[PDB]
Amino acid sequence: RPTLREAVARLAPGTGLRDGLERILRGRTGALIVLGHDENVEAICDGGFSLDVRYAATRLRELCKMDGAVVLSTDGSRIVRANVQLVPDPSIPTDESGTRHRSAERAAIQTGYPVISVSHSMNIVTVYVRGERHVLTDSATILSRANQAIATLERYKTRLDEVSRQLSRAEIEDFVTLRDVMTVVQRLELVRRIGLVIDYDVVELGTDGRQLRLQLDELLGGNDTARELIVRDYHANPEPPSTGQINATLDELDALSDGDLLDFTALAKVFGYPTTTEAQDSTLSPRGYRAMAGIPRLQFAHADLLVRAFGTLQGLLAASAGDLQSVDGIGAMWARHVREGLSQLAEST
Amino acid sequence: RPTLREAVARLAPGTGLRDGLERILRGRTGALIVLGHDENVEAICDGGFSLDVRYAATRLRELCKMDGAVVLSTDGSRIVRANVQLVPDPSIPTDESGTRHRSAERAAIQTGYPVISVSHSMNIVTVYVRGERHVLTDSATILSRANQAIATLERYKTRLDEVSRQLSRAEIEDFVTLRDVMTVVQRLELVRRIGLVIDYDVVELGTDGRQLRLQLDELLGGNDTARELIVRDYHANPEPPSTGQINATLDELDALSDGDLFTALAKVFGYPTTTEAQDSTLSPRGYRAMAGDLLVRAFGTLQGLAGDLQSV
Amino acid sequence: RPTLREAVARLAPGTGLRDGLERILRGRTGALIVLGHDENVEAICDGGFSLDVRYAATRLRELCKMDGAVVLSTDGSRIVRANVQLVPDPSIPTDESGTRHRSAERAAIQTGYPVISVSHSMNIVTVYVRGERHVLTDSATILSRANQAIATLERYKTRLDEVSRQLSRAEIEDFVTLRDVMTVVQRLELVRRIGLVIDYDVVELGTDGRQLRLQLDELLGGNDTARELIVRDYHANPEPPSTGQINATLDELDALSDGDLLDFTALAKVFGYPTTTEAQDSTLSPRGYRAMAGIPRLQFAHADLLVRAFGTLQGLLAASAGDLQSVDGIGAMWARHVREGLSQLAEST
Numbered sequence A, C: 001r002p003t004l005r006e007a008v009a010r011l012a013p014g015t016g017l018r019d020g021l022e023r024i025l026r027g028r029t030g031a032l033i034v035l036g037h038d039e040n041v042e043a044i045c046d047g048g049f050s051l052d053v054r055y056a057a058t059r060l061r062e063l064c065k066m067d068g069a070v071v072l073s074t075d076g077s078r079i080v081r082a083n084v085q086l087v088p089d090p091s092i093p094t095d096e097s098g099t100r101h102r103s104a105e106r107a108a109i110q111t112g113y114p115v116i117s118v119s120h121s122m123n124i125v126t127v128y129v130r131g132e133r134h135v136l137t138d139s140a141t142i143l144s145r146a147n148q149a150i151a152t153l154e155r156y157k158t159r160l161d162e163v164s165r166q167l168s169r170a171e172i173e174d175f176v177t178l179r180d181v182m183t184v185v186q187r188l189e190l191v192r193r194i195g196l197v198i199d200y201d202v203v204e205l206g207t208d209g210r211q212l213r214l215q216l217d218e219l220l221g222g223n224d225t226a227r228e229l230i231v232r233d234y235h236a237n238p239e240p241p242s243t244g245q246i247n248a249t250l251d252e253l254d255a256l257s258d259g260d261l262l263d264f265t266a267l268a269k270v271f272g273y274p275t276t277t278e279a280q281d282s283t284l285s286p287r288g289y290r291a292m293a294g295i296p297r298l299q300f301a302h303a304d305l306l307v308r309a310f311g312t313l314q315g316l317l318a319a320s321a322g323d324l325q326s327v328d329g330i331g332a333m334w335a336r337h338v339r340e341g342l343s344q345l346a347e348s349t
Numbered sequence B: 001r002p003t004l005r006e007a008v009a010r011l012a013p014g015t016g017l018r019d020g021l022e023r024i025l026r027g028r029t030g031a032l033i034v035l036g037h038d039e040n041v042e043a044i045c046d047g048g049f050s051l052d053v054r055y056a057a058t059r060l061r062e063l064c065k066m067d068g069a070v071v072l073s074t075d076g077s078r079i080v081r082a083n084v085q086l087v088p089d090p091s092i093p094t095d096e097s098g099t100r101h102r103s104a105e106r107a108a109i110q111t112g113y114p115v116i117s118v119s120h121s122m123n124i125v126t127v128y129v130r131g132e133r134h135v136l137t138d139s140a141t142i143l144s145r146a147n148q149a150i151a152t153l154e155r156y157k158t159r160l161d162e163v164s165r166q167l168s169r170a171e172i173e174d175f176v177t178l179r180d181v182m183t184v185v186q187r188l189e190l191v192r193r194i195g196l197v198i199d200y201d202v203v204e205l206g207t208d209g210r211q212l213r214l215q216l217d218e219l220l221g222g223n224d225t226a227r228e229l230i231v232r233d234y235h236a237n238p239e240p241p242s243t244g245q246i247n248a249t250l251d252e253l254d255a256l257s258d259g260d261l262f263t264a265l266a267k268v269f270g271y272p273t274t275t276e277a278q279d280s281t282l283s284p285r286g287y288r289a290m291a292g293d294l295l296v297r298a299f300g301t302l303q304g305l306a307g308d309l310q311s312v
């Protein structure tokens, strides 16, 4: 049966239902709509008219001009009853206010289908699904909230870029420390989490969120790959981390609380380094995945072969073109390409 | 328990409740008021707040601005709860329309107390008492309707007086046709029936009916005695009817339909219903002339009517 | 008693009260609410009914449909009276218009508790707190005002950083003038004051200000420390400023009007220098507290003894390693760490 998130989706902008509800709000009639009909719904239905017509936004609006409730079919394709009096079991507990809304939630609990109440006085839509409630929000308000989050995401993306460049400078110089790696890990997670918040707003916006989706995907583009690469470079396991190991590490990062993200030792635990403050100053050596990703045109398949062969970024910098053409799967052309691409990083920083 | 009529009296003009209801109608807020509180009412009361204030029309109006129902104490002197949600058993049958009113009658049946709903859309007050319902009518409408009826009542009384003396003249002649008696009987019944219609309006008017109460009693008064005398004078049984016989006959006429009020009349009086029977001349007994019982049994007829009347 | 700012937070978005007030506005009934109840409130309360219910936004809306005023408990957790007639002392001064609002401000002054009046005609919420007034504003309008203010703050942050770099470069060169120091002082103050304006908007926005708070914290952060150090470095009194004296100077800066902050002579007076034109041209020498604060893990006790011995940053730079071990209370290891850090100032530029 419909879940709370699924029901909100059925009422998202661009849907036939949401069009009808918008019409009801402008009409200021109020409404009480049951999204489903079975034996249990009929049990609580009293009086009213039985009708069999196709759903239409306009048809719903007119029917809700009448006292009572409108029942739709489970698939949502039809309007099955109108002018109904709901009589849910009064023992079902609810903290809502007034006959309409208390009747709505009780009916939602008893039948198991979503129930919608529209307040004529407040012009507010509430949907009740099995003890949970959600109040719809105008697309403008959601956009305002999401654009504030987009602004913060713009600030976190700039901050991530600068610390990442600092880490890249340290990797070339061979003066990286756990603290340097974990500063980037934190900034990667902050970008990810604020991105998840904006994503929920995109879902709630429905068709009104299409542009916000494009902007969000552009800003978040490459964040997943950066999280993978940093795990691949600085994971306490001696051998290069396994693919499942990488997925395990990222899952632990998501499991961290927001407060834990502000703890560099909490992040160090996830990567497998000691949790002591002293451990933050210990020197690390990158494997070279991040640097290789910065080389233009270099497919990750080839970089994985080189990183496993030489072990460390410093080994790759010291390697000759002939040293980089002795790895199976690395041709002469790619050995030259990586050789000049690495020596360009050495000079630049 | 209070009866439907008793409840309507509690809501009549001149009462504190009716002052409150009139204010609610002008406010167009709608209302749902329970006239009584006990465990059974509380059982169906859900949410809301408890308060203990003296009843006042102004206080009732303010509290009914809120969603929900207001409960008063049984004596009606206090307001005990407001903003409550009534939750009567949906199995209780009702043919009312909408959440507010169906809940009102069900609550009235379940608790046994009067329940009032005021519709904001229709500005109509309905009172429910144990499966019965009454709709209040504006005192202005009742007054205007009742005054048209009182105007008719004087006309029925004048037309009754004119025909009654015609019958009395025939009594002198001894040639009173059966149709003549039933013409007077018809006018007596018509006066009685309009009198009952007006009486119901006077009660609903409360204090606004005080003047119509006096006017009604003057026109009617003497109607019961007149109906008793005419049955006592022109009853089929040659024996003078007993007091129980007279009251039984008067009840029989009341059972007649509006349209029937001459052949239908003759049969209740015991005369044959045939249209030929309505043509049969009758002889008055004389009770009416004396009013203008022991003596009449001696003489038998008005035609018989000093020592002979000091012999019985 | 609660202050005006405290009341504004209590009526901000995300609070139970604000949910009720939003409901009242949509109903267009108007309201008169007392945020507190004691014997003094009872004195001015007349008639009405006593109720004891838990506070709820929906309950408040229904009670404010009634003529009169609603009284809440001091903690705000309960609704104790409704339909009350306030009868505050007419002699209490007020500039509000009409019975409702004049009664509201007078009641606020007499009892000492916040009082809210909502105008049905104007759809405006007003809160009165002991002779002050605050009118609630749409969260959209506040956000628009605050985001522009954030834009100005980012520009103030950029100019602050560059003038700060100029001042530090001059400190090494020994060519700092009083005007240059006041250019940095002006920019630090401008950043601080626009920061306070945005802070008030964040409070008023409540839950709608969460993202704005994050942006504000990054832009400002470090502003207090920079103001403290600059006063510590360039204050006219020969004795190094005490911590309390520094706070006194900073309090004098806050007392200046927005117009005064554009006047370099007014700032010069706050630091004890003369207001003359000639004073602006005179060359100063930093005390060196800022440089010591940049040295990692150098407790201010070791910085105050060194600054008191040599007096100026140029004296600290001119000192030898042995000269930094002949100060009482400074160790040999600490003398090495301080000397190396000042040499890193040469690395800076």
Ligand SMILES: Nc1ncnc2c1ncn2[C@@H]1O[C@@H]2COP(=O)(O)O[C@H]3[C@@H](O)[C@H](n4cnc5c(N)ncnc54)O[C@@H]3COP(=O)(O)O[C@H]2[C@H]1O
Binding pocket: A030, A032, A066, A067, A068, A069, A084, A085, A086, A087, A098, A099, A100, A101, A103, A104, B030, B032, B066, B067, B068, B069, B084, B085, B086, B087, B098, B099, B100, B101, B103, B104
């Ligand atoms: N049993 C009861 N106890 C206490 N107060 C009662 C009540 N029944 C009705 N009321 C009051 O009367 C208002 C108008 O009722 P009405 O049935 O015209 O107007 C109703 C009806 O058209 C519909 N509605 C409410 N509950 C319903 C239910 N269980 N089934 C179907 N329709 C319902 O929503 C309208 C507005 O509901 P809302 O509560 O805002 O407004 C209600 C409520 O404040």
Ligand SMILES: [Cl-]
Binding pocket: A097, A101, A119, C058
């Ligand atoms: Cl609601």
Ligand SMILES: [Cl-]
Binding pocket: A086, A087, A088, B086, B087, B088, B103
């Ligand atoms: Cl119900």
Ligand SMILES: [Cl-]
Binding pocket: A124, C019, C022, C023
């Ligand atoms: Cl709301």
